[PDB]
Structures are given as C-alpha cells and as structure tokens.
C-alpha cells in the first residue's frame, strides 16, 4: 500500500497507461473477477475522443484505450486509476459499452483538479 502522485501535466496522446480494477471482464454478460485486473492502454488524441463521443467530451474528460475495442474498462471499474510515469492521470468515468468498436473509455482529467484536491485536503 502506497500513494500515487498527482499529475504535473495534463495527459498526452500516445502515453502508455496502466488501468486497473475489479470490474466486469466481459463485453457480453458478466464475469466479475476475484483478482485485480490490469490493462495497458494508450491515451487517445483529443480529436479521436471528440470524434468518438460528439458533443459529450468536456475539458475535464479524456479518452484512453483502443478504437478497435477489445480492451477497455467496464462496470465496476468506475473510480479506479489510470497511471503513467508514477502519476495519476485519469479516473475511470464512463463509456458506451465495454471494449466496443469506436467507443473507448472516457476518464476524468485529474490534472484539472490538482488545486481542488489540495484545497479540499487543507480545509478538511
């Protein structure tokens, strides 16, 4: 058990990232694992993310994964980490199905909240 560092810069397209969780491991049906699952996936470009989810991507969201599908986060992974170079870049947030084509994972852009996180910790 140890802490992951907050990010020092926003996500960069192409960055290999580690996503993990105990969410569903199937696109169809459900198989919830007992053991923690890992996935290595690259950050997608801002244009690929918007093209995948037109009008629904705010400045506070970014996409990670594969436009071909097959590998993705899923139900039960919500809230978990997307980590690269020792920093927490993303939080599992939403997406259309799991590992569907043209439907990559959408993640909260943690960098945008670095000050909110420090301020909230200091006030509490």
């Amino acid at each position: 058990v140890s802490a992951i560092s907050l990010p020092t810069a926003p996500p960069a397209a192409g960055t290999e990232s580690l996503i993990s969780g105990w969410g569903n491991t199937l696109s169809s049906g459900a198989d919830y694992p007992d053991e923690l699952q890992c996935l290595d996936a690259p950050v997608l470009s801002q244009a690929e993310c918007e093209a995948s989810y037109p009008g629904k991507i705010t400045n506070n969201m970014f996409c990670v994964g594969f436009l071909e599908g097959g590998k993705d986060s899923c139900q039960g992974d919500s809230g978990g980490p997307v980590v690269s170079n020792g920093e927490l870049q993303g939080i599992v947030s939403w997406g259309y199905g799991c590992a569907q084509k043209n439907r990559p994972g959408v993640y909260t852009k943690v960098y945008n909240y670095v000050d909110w996180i420090k301020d909230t910790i200091a006030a509490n």
Partner: protein
C-alpha cells in the same frame, strides 16, 4: 477490465476497492489519509479496502478503513458526468507498507 491480465499481487499498491456491502467502485490512494475516486461512486457510507488482490479471500495485506468524509466535486453533473471526481478522507491514516 475487459481484455486485460491479472495484476501481479500488490503490484498496484495505490489501488483501492470501495465496498458498501459489496465491491462497487475503485479508487486511488493519494496520501496517507485521502483517496480519489469518481463522483458517480458517491455513497453515504463507504469502506475503503486497501492492500487487496483477491477481494473475496483474506490473504494477509488488507487494510479495511471506513470513510470519515466523502466529498464530491461541487460542480459534479449527474447527467453529463462532468467533474466526475470525489475525495474520501479515511477515518484513520493508511499504513504505508510499500517502499
């Protein structure tokens, strides 16, 4: 996680499971006493389970610490999931056992 692999046990030491009678969300330890998760994981009562690998079997490294404060981003939007972020203050500091 679809299409992934089983993580090496305790190789993801910041990964936590959020439990409210069952595993319902993940989160990340970011200091001794604070966890970051998604705003749509908000629940009024949350137990944070650190040091987990198999979440059904007690294997030896678990820390179960209840949330003392659960603070969702004030501009969280439940329809669009804009500002999907939440902070959890643990009732006690987690024991940092990884160097």
């Amino acid at each position: 996680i679809v299409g992934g692999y089983i993580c090496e046990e305790n190789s993801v030491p910041y990964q936590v499971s959020l439990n409210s009678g069952y595993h319902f969300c993940g989160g990340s330890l970011i200091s001794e006493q604070w966890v970051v998760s998604a705003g749509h994981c908000y629940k009024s009562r949350i137990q944070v389970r650190l040091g987990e690998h198999n979440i059904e079997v007690l294997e030896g490294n678990e820390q179960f610490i209840n949330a003392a404060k659960i603070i969702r981003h004030p501009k969280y939007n439940s329809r669009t999931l804009d500002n999907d972020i939440l902070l959890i203050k643990l009732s006690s500091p987690a024991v940092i056992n990884s160097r």
